[PDB]
């Protein structure tokens, strides 16, 4: 499992959110944040199966790209476990 | 050490916060976020010792459970280190 974090300009929220839906990813979390690189930013977190990693950074990158400074960055970390409180399903079954 | 992240409906904040206190966990961080699954959500992060993992997801799950869609999810990641700036204590001593 992986946790993929995208931090971008608040205006590209729509573009990345729709890109995500393309490959069947609707579950996600968005935090209003400030990035010093201080300006308003949108942080988007998404837990996925290992098999989807390259598929996700690909679609996100293209969705955010403009070629101009400030397109954003992608951060990847390992997720030891995910649990759906309602069912108790874990990992891939919890998504 | 582990980082346990709970994302739930803003109204269950109290229930989970009290559940946490039951097993002696008062240290925690809460972020107002939006979850697309877009609606206001409460993200609760809590760093703990390894020995407390099952104890924590157990109490949180029961505290949040209703059986109805939207009970929330739990995300677990490894924490390489924790430091208490004031003392310089690390890990379990930093909690
Ligand atoms: N090293 C970092 N550590 C933590 N947050 C970071 C780091 N680098 C960037 N960020 C976050 O990611 C956001 C997006 O970065 P952005 O792409 O705008 O950076 P830039 O340096 O201005 O341009 P570019 O990435 O195109 O060179 C930043 O506003 C900030 O919130
Ligand atoms: N795969 C994911 N990646 C990132 N954030 C997620 C993911 N799945 C859920 N979340 C976050 O967790 C919150 C709680 O999920 P919630 O339990 O409400 O999901 P659901 O699919 O509506 O219902 P259920 O979990 O009961 O099937 C979401 O609003 C979102 O902020």
From Swiss-Prot, chains A, B:
Uridylylated/deuridylylated by GlnD. Fully uridylylated in nitrogen-limited conditions and deuridylylated when extracellular ammonium increases. Uridylylation abrogates binding to AmtB. Keywords: ATP-binding, Cell inner membrane, Cell membrane, Cytoplasm, Membrane, Nucleotide-binding, Phosphoprotein. GO terms for cellular component: cytosol; plasma membrane. It comes from the Bacteria. SUPFAM superfamilies: GlnB-like (SSF54913). Disruption phenotype: Mutant lacking this gene shows very high expression of the glnK and nac promoters in nitrogen-starved cells, and has a severe defect in the growth rate recovery in ammonia after nitrogen starvation. GO terms for molecular function: ATP binding; enzyme regulator activity; identical protein binding. ADP binds at residues 29, 47, 70-73, 84-86. PROSITE patterns: PII_GLNB_CTER, PII_GLNB_DOM, PII_GLNB_UMP. Coiled coil: none annotated. Formation of the GlnK-AmtB complex is influenced by intracellular pools of the effector molecules ATP, ADP, Mg(2+) and 2-oxoglutarate. The rapid drop in the 2-oxoglutarate pool upon ammonium influx and a simultaneous, but transient, change in the ATP/ADP ratio promotes AmtB-GlnK complex formation. ADP orients the surface of GlnK for AmtB blockade. The GlnK-AmtB interaction is also controlled by the level of intracellular glutamine and the uridylylation status of GlnK. Signal peptide: none annotated. The keyword Phosphoprotein applies. One of its GO terms (biological process) is regulation of nitrogen utilization. ATP binds at residues 37, 47, 70-73, 84-86. Pfam families: P-II. Induction: Expression is regulated by the nitrogen status. May be regulated through the NRI/NRII two-component regulatory system. NCBIfam families: PRK10665.1. Belongs to the P(II) protein family. Homotrimer. In response to elevation of the extracellular ammonium concentration, interacts and forms a complex with AmtB. Binds to the cytoplasmic face of AmtB with a stoichiometry of AmtB(3):GlnK(3). Sequestration by AmtB is reversible. In nitrogen-poor medium, can form heterotrimers with GlnB (PII protein). Uridylylation probably sterically blocks the T-loop region from interacting with AmtB. Involved in the regulation of nitrogen metabolism. Regulates the activity of its targets by protein-protein interaction in response to the nitrogen status of the cell. Involved in the regulation of the ammonium transporter AmtB so as to optimize ammonium uptake under all growth conditions. In nitrogen-limited conditions, GlnK does not interact with AmtB, which remains active and imports ammonium. When extracellular ammonium increases, GlnK associates tightly with AmtB in the inner membrane, thereby inhibiting the transporter activity. This is Nitrogen regulatory protein GlnK. It comes from Escherichia coli (strain K12). The lineage of its organism: Bacteria, Pseudomonadati, Pseudomonadota, Gammaproteobacteria, Enterobacterales. The gene is glnK.
């Amino acid at each position: 499992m992986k946790l993929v974090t995208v931090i971008i300009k608040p205006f590209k929220l729509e573009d990345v959110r729709e890109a995500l839906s393309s490959i069947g990813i609707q579950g996600l979390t968005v935090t209003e944040v400030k990035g010093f690189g201080f300006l308003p930013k949108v942080k988007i977190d998404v837990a996925i199966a290992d098999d989807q990693l390259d598929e996700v950074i690909d679609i996100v990158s293209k969705a955010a790209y403009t070629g101009k400074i400030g397109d954003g960055k992608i951060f990847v970390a390992e997720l030891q476990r995910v649990i759906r409180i309602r069912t108790g399903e874990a990992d891939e079954a919890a998504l």
